[PDB]
Symmetry: C2
């Protein structure tokens, strides 16, 4: 009935076999809450390794994919390949893909539709830049990005939405609990009016942007924040504390 | 003195464990000419698998990488990771990177410098579009693309240039042997004038764009064509024939 708390780790472009191996050993050995759904997003080269080594109870996500199953796209991977190695999730629309690599809402929407058709879960990311926030246009931006995704989702049961203020990613500035709650409750109301009440009540909306062991309890306690997408701290032992933020 | 014949296979976004497993078994079982240097470019998610399964005389290439060893670049992999799993090459500046994904000359140049600094070999791609060839400007386009790469190269010993006309990639159209020789010869004279004689004489310049079992011998016979980068036919048993083009 209540939405299951969800914590994702995004390792970004970090790790080697030795260091990722150590991190995974730690996670497997920790006491993690029975009521948190945990997913680790590994570099593509280490997806197979990560799935082999991680406790099955912990999910594995790719950090990107492309929009068709196969073909002449040098350097890309498809949902079919991700499923083949046993990963169950993909992260789409991350700030770094949008703003460093130039991925448009239209591309991201096609990626979302293809991932879902192939049976993967999607962590779909949205968020505003500082200049947008300061111009009063957070709601407009966040709703535009969300519509582009929603228009391409036919089954909401394997979607998680991640709200990541761009100014909060990797900077140490985090949104206040009140800043996060405002956006998350507005996103939920958007889902209610534009999709359905059932989808609004069931869909996890998670916060990302400088989540650490020090701030996770306060953020987690907000009524419409259902978890986190964690970058820098997901490579450290305090990731365990974040997974257990509700306890 | 002369240059070792070089054949790279670019698998692009194709395969699964089962299917690539059967392809690797074929290559390992085949009689491949000892005087051909062979490299297979696998999808990033299968790079570790491919290097584990392929006989040691066959080199493994990543299909792309980014320009720093680590950091906040969701979806990317670095040379340090490629090296970690035991691959020795990377393909950079592929037409699909430049034209589907919008990678610039300056970015490709910074990727080349970084992969070389980290001990990888680089297969560096250049090529003109149909409209450029028809306008009669092939030479201008290849010489600018080449200058971008070369300004970032201090040791040419681990660099292979791949001339691939964009209009020939995946379509079945191939440059005539005379068209390919013409460009290769001009590229070599540019390396002579702007780098050195010895680099000109030692650097392999390979041709790609719809190389098959049927045209490889006619292509390989040209003086300044030192090998091939093969896409489509690299997933097929005739790949063995292409490796053996000189015999």
């Amino acid at each position: 009935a209540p939405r299951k708390f969800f914590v994702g780790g995004n390792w970004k472009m970090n790790g080697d076999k030795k260091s990722l191996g150590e991190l995974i050993h730690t996670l497997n050995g920790a006491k993690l809450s029975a009521d948190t759904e945990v997913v680790c997003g590994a570099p593509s080269i280490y997806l197979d390794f990560a799935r082999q080594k991680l406790d099955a109870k912990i999910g594995v996500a790719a950090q990107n994919c492309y929009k068709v199953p196969k073909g002449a796209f040098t350097g890309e991977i498809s949902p079919a390949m991700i499923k083949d190695i046993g990963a169950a999730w993909v992260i789409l629309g991350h700030s770094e893909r949008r703003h460093v690599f130039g991925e448009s809402d239209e591309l991201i929407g096609q990626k979302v539709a293809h991932a879902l058709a192939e049976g993967l879960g999607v962590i779909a990311c949205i968020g505003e830049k500082l200049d947008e926030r300061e111009a009063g246009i957070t709601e407009k931006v966040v709703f535009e990005q969300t519509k582009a995704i929603a228009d391409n989702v036919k089954d909401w049961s394997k979607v998680v939405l991640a709200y990541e203020p761009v100014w909060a990613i990797g900077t140490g500035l985090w949104a206040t609990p009140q800043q996060a709650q405002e956006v998350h409750e507005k996103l939920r109301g958007w889902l209610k009016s534009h999709v359905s009440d059932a989808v609004a009540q069931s869909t996890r909306i998670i916060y990302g942007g400088s989540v650490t062991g020090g701030n996770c309890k306060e953020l987690a306690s907000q009524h419409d924040v259902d978890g986190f997408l964690v970058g820098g701290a997901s490579l450290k032992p305090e990731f365990v504390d974040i997974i257990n933020a509700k306890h």
